[PDB]
Symmetry: none
Subunit: 380 residues, 4 copies
Amino acid sequence: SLVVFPFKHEHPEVLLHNVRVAAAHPRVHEVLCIGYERDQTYEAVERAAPEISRATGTPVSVRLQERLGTLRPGKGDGMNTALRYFLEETQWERIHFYDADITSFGPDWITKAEEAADFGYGLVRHYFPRASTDAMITWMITRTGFALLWPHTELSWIEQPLGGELLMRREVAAMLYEDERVRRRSDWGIDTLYTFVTVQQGVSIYECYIPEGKAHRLYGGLDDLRTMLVECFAAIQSLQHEVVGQPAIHRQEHPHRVPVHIAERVGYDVEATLHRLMQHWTPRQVELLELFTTPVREGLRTCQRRPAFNFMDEMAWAATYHVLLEHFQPGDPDWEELLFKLWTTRVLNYTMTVALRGYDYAQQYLYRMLGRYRYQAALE
Amino acid sequence: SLVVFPFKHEHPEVLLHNVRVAAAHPRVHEVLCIGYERDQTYEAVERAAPEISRATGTPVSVRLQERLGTLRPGKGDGMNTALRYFLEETQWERIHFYDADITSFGPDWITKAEEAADFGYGLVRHYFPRASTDAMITWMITRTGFALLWPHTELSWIEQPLGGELLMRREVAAMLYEDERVRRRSDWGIDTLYTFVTVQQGVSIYECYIPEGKAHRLYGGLDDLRTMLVECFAAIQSLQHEVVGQPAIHRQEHPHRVPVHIAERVGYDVEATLHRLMQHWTPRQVELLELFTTPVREGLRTCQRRPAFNFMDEMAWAATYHVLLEHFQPGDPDWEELLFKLWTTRVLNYTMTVALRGYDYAQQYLYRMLGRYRYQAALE
Amino acid sequence: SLVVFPFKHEHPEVLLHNVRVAAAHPRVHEVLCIGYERDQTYEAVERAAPEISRATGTPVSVRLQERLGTLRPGKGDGMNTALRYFLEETQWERIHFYDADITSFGPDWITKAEEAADFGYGLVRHYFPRASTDAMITWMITRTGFALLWPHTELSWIEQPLGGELLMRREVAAMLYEDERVRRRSDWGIDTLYTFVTVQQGVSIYECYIPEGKAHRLYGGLDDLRTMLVECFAAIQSLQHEVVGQPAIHRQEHPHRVPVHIAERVGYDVEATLHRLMQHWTPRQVELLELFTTPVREGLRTCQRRPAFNFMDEMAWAATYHVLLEHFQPGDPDWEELLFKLWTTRVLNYTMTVALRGYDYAQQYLYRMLGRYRYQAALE
Amino acid sequence: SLVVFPFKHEHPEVLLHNVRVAAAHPRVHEVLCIGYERDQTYEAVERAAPEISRATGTPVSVRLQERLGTLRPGKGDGMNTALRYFLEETQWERIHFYDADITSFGPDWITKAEEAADFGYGLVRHYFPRASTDAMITWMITRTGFALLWPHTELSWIEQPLGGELLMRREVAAMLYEDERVRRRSDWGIDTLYTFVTVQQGVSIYECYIPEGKAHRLYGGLDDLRTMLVECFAAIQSLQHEVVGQPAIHRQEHPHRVPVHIAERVGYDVEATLHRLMQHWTPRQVELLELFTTPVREGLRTCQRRPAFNFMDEMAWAATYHVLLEHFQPGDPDWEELLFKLWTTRVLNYTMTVALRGYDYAQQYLYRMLGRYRYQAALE
C-alpha cells in the first residue's frame, strides 16, 4: 500500500517519526510526503527520507503539491496530488492518508485500516473522540448541512467527514481523482468532497475507532478556524442541488469510553471569541441581516454593542443555515464575516446550554440534534 | 392501523392500560389481543373491550391463539394468528406488535413507528437500552449465529432480532404469513424467523430507539430462559444452509444515553446459575461432550463437581457454536441440557471477564465481539 | 423540638406543605413561621394553623420579624427573632431552621438532625449537592475568606457556611442570641455569623448529607445575587481581625453520588452576566481600581468596553480579596458595584476554565483551591 | 528526610529506579532499603547503592530487617527496623515509607508529603483509587471493624488504613516505636497498628491523593490474600477493648476522576474463588458454625456441596464480624479457614450485588456501608 502524509509547516521530527512507523509496517510498500512548499519542514523531510528508505527497505519520497484545483491552494491540492501520483506512477492497490502532526501514531492504525479493507470496504475512515467544544465545524456546519439537505441518506451519519485519516482502495481513488468537483476543491473543502462523493457513489465505508492521536490546535478564539469555516461551508453550498440515493453500506466500530483528557478539554478561548464577535462590523453586514429571521437579525445586530448568543438556539441555527445556503457569496468579505459571526453565536449558545452540562450530556445532545434536523428536513 | 398485544395470564391491569393507550391513539383503527386460553385475564379484556371501544371509537377484540405451526405452541402461533386476522379480517395498511407486559408503553411508541412507515419503510423495529447481563440469548445465540454464518449480510447488524415490538406494512405481513418456515415456527423462534426472512427478502428496515426501556423478568437463574434458549438456537440451526444476499436499506436511530437504572441493573441470579450448572447431568451428556474441543469437553465435565467457566471465552464459544450447529438435536433432552449448560458457562465467563468491568466496557466488547466473529467467518 | 420556617414571597402552598411535614413528625413539639409583614402568605398560614394544630397535636404559630439588628432588615432579623421566641417563650431543647421554599422537604431531614443531636452534637448542619455554577458566593467569598484568613482552623472546612438548614441545641442558640456580633447581623450575613461564632466557640458540629438536594433560584444573571454577595463579603470583612483557635469536634457524613440533574445544571445566565458587567460604571469605580494589582485594574477597566475575565484567575482573586478586605466600604454604592463586577469576573473565569471541563473536574478544583489558599496563607 | 523502601522479592530494577528518584530529590537526605533476607533482590540492591549515592550525593544504605516483634516475621519487622534506624542512628526530622514495587513513583509524591508536613501535619498518608474488587481486606475487615467498634472516632474515616505509603514526623515515629502493641506486630498487621495508634494518640493526619502507582497483585483467587486477611483481622481483634476519644484532625485531598484502567479492573479470579470455598472443610469447621447466626451457619455449610454467598449480605457480615471478634483464635487453622470462607462469601456477595452494577455504584455503596455500620454500632 501507499501511505501519504500531506504536510505544510508541522514540526518535522513528529512527521519523520510517523513516516518511520509507516515505512516499517509490513503492509506498506511506499511512503509519500506531499509538501505545501519548499520550507524548513520540507528540506528536513527531503534530507531524512533516504536514511528511512535504507533502514526499512521501504521507499520514502517527498514531492511538492501540484496546482490541480481552482480555489485557495491548500489541503485539496495536496491530497489530489497524492491521488495523481498513486494512480499514474504506482501500481499499489490501496492508499492511506494521515495528518503529519498526529501524536499517537502506531502500526495498529495502519493494520486496522488494512484489515477492514481486507473485509471488502472501499473506504475506511479513522475517527477519534473529541472535546465537547472541538469539532464545531464538523457538527454545526458539515454534519448539520448533510442532515438538513439529505436527511434520508448516509451523509450525516459519517462521524468525522472532515477527517484526514483514511484508506481508499484504488478504484475509489480513481473515481475521486476523475471527478471535477473533487479536483477543483484545492482548499479545506476537499474532505467534504471526498466524503460526499464516496457516499453519493455508493462506496462501502467502515469507520475505525482510534482513542487518541489528533493534535490539538493552539489555544485561541474561533477566529483561528475562520478560513476552514468559510471553505467548508462553501463546499456544502456548492453541493446543495445534488441528488443522493439512500443505498449505503456504512459501519462504525463501537467507541471505547472517552479518555479523561479529552472529556476535560476546552477547545477555544471564550473571552477572545466574545470580543471578536463585536469586531469588524460594516454597514453592509448590518443590512444583509435583513435576509434572516427577526430573532437572528436583531440578535446579531446586538453584537455591535455587546456579545449576544442566547437567540441562536438549535432551530434558529437551521433557519439561519438555509438563508446562508441561498444568499452566501463565497469570497465576499461581508458574507464570510457574517457566516463567521453567526456560527460564533451558535457555538457560544451550544457551549453555555449544552457543553457546560458536561461531556456525556453534550455527546447525547449532538446526535439527537442531527436526528431532529433530519426529521424536520424530511417533513418540509 | 391494527395494534396487537399477545398476552399471557400476567398482570391484566397492565394489558388493559396498554390497550387503552393504543385505542386512544389517533392513527390506531383497531386493537387485537391474542391469548392461549380463556383464563381470567382473557375474560377481563373481553369484558372491558366494549367500554374501551365506545369511549375511543376504536374496536377492541380478543381472540384465541390458533395452532398454525408444528413446534411447541408458544409465541409464534400467537403472532401468526394475529397476522392471519390482519390479512383475512381487516384492510388496514399496517400492523403493530407490542408485548402486553410492557410498563412504559406510551403513544409516542406508536407515533414513531407510524411516521417511519410514512417514509416507506416496510418494517419498523423498536429497540431499547438493556442491562449488560440481559439479552444473553440475543448476543450469544442470535447475533452471534448471524455473524458466524452470514458475516457480509445485514442480519447481525439488526440490534434486537428477538424484539417483539415492531410495525409491518401489509405487504411484509403477507409475505411472512405465506412463508412456510415462518408459519411453522410456533414457539419462541418466531422473532428470529421474522427478522431473518425480512432481511433475506430485502425489506427496508428502520430501527427506532425507545430511550426509557421496557420490562424486566423476575429475578432468577438463567434456567428461567432455558426454553427460549433452546428454541432460539434451533431457529438459527434450521436456517444455517440458507443463502442471504447483500444489505438492503437499513436506517438505525442513534442510541440515546443509557438510563442509570439500566446500566446498574443485574439481569440474573449468579448463585442460582452456578448451582444449576451442577444439576441434571446424565452419562449421555458426558458422552456428547466428545464432539467438542478438548478445553470445552474438560471444562464442562468439571461442572459435575464444581462450577467452571473460565474456559468458555469468545473463541471457545465460536467453536462450540459450530459443533452445536452440526450436532444439536432439538427435542432431545440431553442435547437441550448440554446447550443450556454450555450457554450458561459462556454467560458466566462474559459476566466475570467483561460485565464486571462496567457497562461501557461491556457495550464495546459485545459490538466488537460481533465484528471479530464476522471478520473471522469471512476469512476462513 | 421547635421547627422554624422563615418565609417571604414564596407561594404559600410550598410553605404550608413543609409546615404539615414538621408538625406531623413525632419529635417536633412546635412549628414557628416568621415573615416580614402581614401579606397574603402570612394570612394563609395564620388561617391554616389551627387546623394543622388540631390534626397533628403540634402547635403552629406565625410571628412577625422583629428589628433586632442594625444592618438591612433581612434574614438575620428573622432568624434572631426565632431564637428569641425559642429561648423566651418555649422550653424545647432543640431548634431547627429550614428555608420555607424547599420543595424536597421530608421527615427524614428532621430525623437525621435529631438523631445526630442525641449523640451530643451542639450544631447539626444539613448540606446538599450543588451544581458547579451554583454556590459561587459560598466558594469564592465565604469559604475562600475563611481559608485565606484562618487556614489552621475548622472554618473553611464547613461545607455550606451559608446554609439555612440546621439544628441547634438550646445552649448553642442561647450563646448565639447573646452575642452582639450575631444580633446585629440582620441581613444575609447571619448564616456566616452563626457558622463563625459556633466554630470560634468550639461547638461540636455534625454535617449531614441530604442527597436529594434543595431549591433552585429563578434563572438569571449573577446580579440576582448582588445584595447577598455584598452582605456576605461584609460579614467576612467584619470578622477579619478575630482570633480563632484550633479545630474542635467536626463529623461530616460522606457525600453520596451527585444526582445527574444537579451535575448537569447551569446555575446562571452567562449572556446576561456578560452584559451586566459592562453596565453601571462610574468614574469613581474606575479610580478605585488604582488600589488593585495591575492585571486586575487593567482587566476590569476593559469591561467598560467589552467583557474581560481571563485575568481573574485563582491567584488574582486572592490578591483582589485582600485589597477588598482592607478598602471595601459596605453601603458605598461604588464599592458595592466594584465588588460585584470583580466577583462576576472570577465566576466567569472559573466557569470557562473549570466548570466547562465537567462536574468532577470542578469539584476537585474547588476543594483543592481552598487547599492552595490555606497553604499559601499559612506560609506567609 | 529519610525515605525507606521495605522490600522482599520485588523486581530489583523497579526498586532501584524508585531509590534513584528518592535520592535525587532535594528534600531527601538519605535512602534506606530494608530487606527481608539476603536474596537476589537484596544483592542487586547492595551492589547498586554505591553508584546511586555517588551520582545523587545522597547516601543510600541497605540493611536486613531485624526480629523486633513476636508474630510472623514480616512487613512489621521491616517497618519497625526502619523506625529504629531513623530514631537511633539519624537526626532526620521526617521519615517516608514507600512500597518497593510502586509503578509510577516520581518526585511529586515526596514533594506532596513534605509540603503537607510543612503545613503542620504529624502523619501524611498517600491514597490511591482502587478497582471495585480490590481492597477487600481494607473495606470488609479493617474499615468495617473500625466502624463497628469505634463508630464515633476518626478510625473508619482513614482511606486505606493498610497503605504503606506515608510520611511521619520524628515524634510520631518515636511514639510508635516505643509502643509495645506496635513493636510486637511483626506481620501484615503493622499498618493497622500504625493507623490505630496514631489516631488514638490524636496525631493530625493528612491524606494526599495519588491517581496511580499501586502495583496490582498477580491474577488469582482470594486465597492469595489469606495470610494478610487472617493477620489483619487478628490485629483488629487484638485492639477491640481499647478506648479511643473523638478529637481528631484528619483531612483528605479531594480525588480526581478514577482512571479508566482502574475502573475497568477486576481484582480476583471468581471461578478459583468459588472453587476454593468448597475446599479444606473439616468436621470442626462445620461444628464451629454453631456459634454464628442461623442464615450464616446454614449458608456456609452449603459450601461443602456448592458455592453459596447470597446469604452474606451487609447485615449478615456485621453479625458475623462480632461472632469472629469474640471466638476467633489466631493461629488456629480451623478458625483461620472459617474467617477466610466467611470473608470470601462476603466478597462474592458484594461482587455480584454491588461491583457488577459498576464502579460509581460501588464507590458510593462502600462509603454508605460504613455509614450504616457506624450508625448501627452507635445505637447498640
